Amino acid sequence: RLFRWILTRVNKALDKTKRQGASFLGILDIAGFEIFEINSFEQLCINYTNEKLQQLFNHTMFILEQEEYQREGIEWNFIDFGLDLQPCIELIERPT
Amino acid sequence: TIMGFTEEEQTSILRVVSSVLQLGNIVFKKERNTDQASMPDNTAAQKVCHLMGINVTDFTRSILTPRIKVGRDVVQKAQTKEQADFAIEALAKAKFE
Amino acid sequence: FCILHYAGKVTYNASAWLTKNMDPLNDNVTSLLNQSSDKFVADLWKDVD
Amino acid sequence: NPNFVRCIIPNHEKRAGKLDAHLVLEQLRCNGVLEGIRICRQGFPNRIVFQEFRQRYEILAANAIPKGFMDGKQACILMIKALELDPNLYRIGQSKIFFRTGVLAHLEEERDLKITDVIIAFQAQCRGYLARKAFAKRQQQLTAM
Amino acid sequence: WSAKKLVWVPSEKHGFEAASIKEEKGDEVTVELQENGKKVTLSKDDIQKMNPPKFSKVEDMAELTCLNEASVLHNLRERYFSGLIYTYSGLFCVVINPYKQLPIYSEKIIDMYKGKKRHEMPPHIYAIADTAYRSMLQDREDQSILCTGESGAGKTENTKKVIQYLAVVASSYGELEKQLLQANPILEAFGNAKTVKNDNSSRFGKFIRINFDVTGYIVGANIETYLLEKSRAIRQAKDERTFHIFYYLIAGASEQMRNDLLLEGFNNYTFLSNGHVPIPAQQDDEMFQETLEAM
Amino acid sequence: DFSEEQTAEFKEAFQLFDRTGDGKILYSQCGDVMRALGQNPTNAEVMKVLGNPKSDEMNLKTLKFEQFLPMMQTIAKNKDQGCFEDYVEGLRVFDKEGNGTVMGAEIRHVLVTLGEKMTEEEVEQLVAGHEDSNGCINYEELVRMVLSG
Ligand SMILES: Nc1ncnc2c1ncn2[C@@H]1O[C@H](COP(=O)(O)OP(=O)(O)O)[C@@H](O)[C@H]1O
Ligand SMILES: [Mg+2]
DSSP states (O other), X not given: OHHHHHHHXXXXXXXXOOOOSXXXXXXXXXXXXXXXXXXXXXXXXXXXXXXXXXXXXXXIIIIIHHHHHHHHOSSOOOOOOOXXXXXXXXXXXXXX | OTTSOOHHHHHHHHHHHHHHHHGGGOOOEEOSSSSOEEOOOOHHHHHHHHXXXXXXXXXXXXXXXXXXXXXXXXXXXXXXXXXXXXHHHHHHHHHHO | OOEEOSSSEEOOOOSSHXXXXXXXXXXXXXXXXXXXXXXXXXXXXXXXX | OOOEEEEEOOOSSOXXXXXXXXXXXXXXXXXXXXXXXXXXXXXXXXEEEHHHHHXXXXXXXXXXXXXXXXXXXXXHHHHHHHHXXXXXXXXXOSSEEEOOTTHHHHHHHHHHHHHHHHHXXXXXXXXXHHHHHHHHHHHHHHHHO | OOSTTOEEEEOSSSSEEEEOOOOOBTTBEEEEOTTTOOEEEEOSOOOBOOOOTTOTTOSBTTSOSSOXXXXXXXXXXXXHHTTOOOOEETTEEEEEOOXXXXXXXXXXXXXXXXXXXXXXXXXXXXXXXXXXXXXXXXSSSOEEEEEEOSSSSSTTHHHHHHHHHHHHHOOOOOHHHHHHHHHHHHHHHTTOOOOSSOSSOOOSOEEEEEEEOSSOOOOOOOEEOOOOOGGXXXXXXXXXXXXXXXXXXXXXXXXXXXXXXXXXXXXXXSSOOSOXXXXXXXXSHHHHHHHHHHO | OOOHHHHHHHHHHHHHOOTTOSSSBOHHHHHHHHHHTTOOOOTTHHHHTTOOOOOOOSSOOOBOHXXXXXXXXXXXTXXXXXXXXXXXXXXXXXXXXXXXXXXXXXXXXXXXXXXXXXOHHHHHHHSSTTOOSTTOOOSSHHXXXXXXX
């Protein structure tokens, strides 16, 4: 709760005028991934997030670039990439 | 002239009426895959954009598919033929009035 | 909507009357024309609206 | 339009210098940067709309077509003729342009080489104007004297 | 020639090492390492050929001919040996942990990177940062920077460099930029920890989006964190030193507050029990004095 | 050569530059004054005319009227005569605004960065000659006034 209050305080410190619509650009820094002997659930979630974003990068790059290649479809043929780990990360939770 | 109008204002009025009459020359077509419109020929687009002297590429992207200031996020939504037309006559009526 | 007017019965028709009534507009193009090259074409939209 | 910058760790000793190859080898193998190398070798990494390409790169054309207010795609075809490239270097799309790496840098090199003569010619014109003004000043000073 | 007689084959001192092409019998060849003159047999076609030895320190690995790896490793280690840390691949960049200090963040270089083409100067993270703004302005909107790596290494310095560079570019006299910059020390010193892999840590996922205008200048910002490791506090073990806040506010304050408070020594604390002397970072005057001035 | 009125103008200019003795003619002097006399291009003329890169002494460089004339008529054939189209196109490419909001700063940058270079003296005579307001010209009036010699 003290950390929450201090982060809200620094927010209000940076709470200058909030205009809307002009432009923006985002920057993200995730926590790292480590393999240590004794781990709780939170570090497992962090590692799952890292694997999730790596899969996001791979799928984004390959699948999306190839789908625009078909979308214009001037002169192109299907190419093989593979490297998909979505079934591995799906095992986290699905009550179905 | 008798009312006290310089000739340049009359030329500007003629420019406005020329723009509103030339505005309807825009022709759109389907994208063959989705509801997105297609704009293959910008002849009339270039003429009219130069008539108001604004950036056509920004104008073209906005008119063909505008970005909505919905407040949630920044999103541009695909439109249809009827939406583009409705915008065309809305602009025409606003200009004339 | 056939009703008896001043002179006689008249014939009406619904053709998206609400659409004509609201008369939507695009803010993006309206904001674009807020700043234009020619003075008069700006005057068509220089007023706050 | 995301952009990525990766990082690698060279050792477990937590010191500086004298790294070990196989650790970073495994790191790059799992990261799959080699797949990005394959796609950059094969795939086309540049997409440009027709109009901005038409306006931005016109000095090298050296043939200013005056048929304004029409023929955007025809202007693109004329620029392709002005580029005299082999069929593999270009693949015109419905609304974008497909190229391969290296053509863009060549374009900026050509245009930066081209603009030099124009700017130095304008500079020489300004020098001539200043020379004429100075000569007129000296002449009027002499006649006043 | 026609084989270079030094094609890379897998080794143990390095991942791959050269091989001398000689008499071959059914792909079985007893190649010798020209660097060692040790004839070793080989049957598998594990040839990793090289480009001719004239492309020293290739700016981008696209002029090559064979898509091998040992030559790639050779280029990477050549760049590493000379401090050229910002090598990049096709459409993205890769770095290695320097563990050293270089004066590459000079303001003159910042000015020299101001608005140039990608192929004009040697690659550097400031060049990407500056290219980002022009990329945002040339198209409609929505630029983004994403970075990702094993554990925490550089997961923070590059973001700091980006923030500093954008603050330098941010202009129209810099008090708001100074506040935005000093915000990171506050959260960092209030959030850093000590870990076996790195005594510099980050107990959360940090995200930020700058807010621009038509000119592209800062108007405001907002930061949202994600799941600080709450359990770190009570548990304690080797290198499991909880947080710098306690370790440097145990004594980093006036004696008057010591009398007012109920602070204890490194042994009297029932909760705290370890030797915190492996702290070669600073002398903890900064942590409270500079934090107070920043606040 | 044309009729003798150009020779008379050359003689009166010869009287006009009488510093350090009227008799001896300096290539630095004649080039500049003849640029004032309707010869805009002078960059390549330092090497094309002299045929010698020896530009050491500004005091005694041997140029005489007798050989100064035929060289001038050979140069008078108008080796190159540019026209305003390329100039205005290059300025518009150089123009980052299209109307003339703030031109002085980048004009100074390009002039101090250009190969032939301009010292700041040219910078203060820039503000004169109708170029007083901050970008009052959209690169057509300045073209007309510079093309007046
Ligand atoms: N780009 C860099 N330049 C210089 N030093 C760095 C860089 N990245 C990391 N370091 C050093 O490595 C340590 C860890 O930093 P970093 O990886 O950014 O944070 P974290 O370890 O929490 O991810 C820091 O103490 C810093 O001195
Ligand atoms: Mg970190």
